[PDB]
Amino acid sequence: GTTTMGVKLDDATRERIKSAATRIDRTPHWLIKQAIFSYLEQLENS
């Protein structure tokens, strides 16, 4: 029960993700999932 979804991002955003992930010793993939869970927690909380 796992699927790969494509997210279309401009190069500026991609580079922001890469830089941020490295700083926190994470992969860009982790960073995106963390982003998703954080935003979902904020929407679902209400």
Added chain:
Amino acid sequence: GTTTMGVKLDDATRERIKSAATRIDRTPHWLIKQAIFSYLEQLENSD
């Protein structure tokens, strides 16, 4: 330019995104992008 990167999501996460996106009149793709923007801003800001 533009790049497409694959995010590996389990079905529970995929359905949560779909449900929440519909509730806010958006697509799952938009929601993921918004999540990214919001998280990056919080990550980049000085406290």
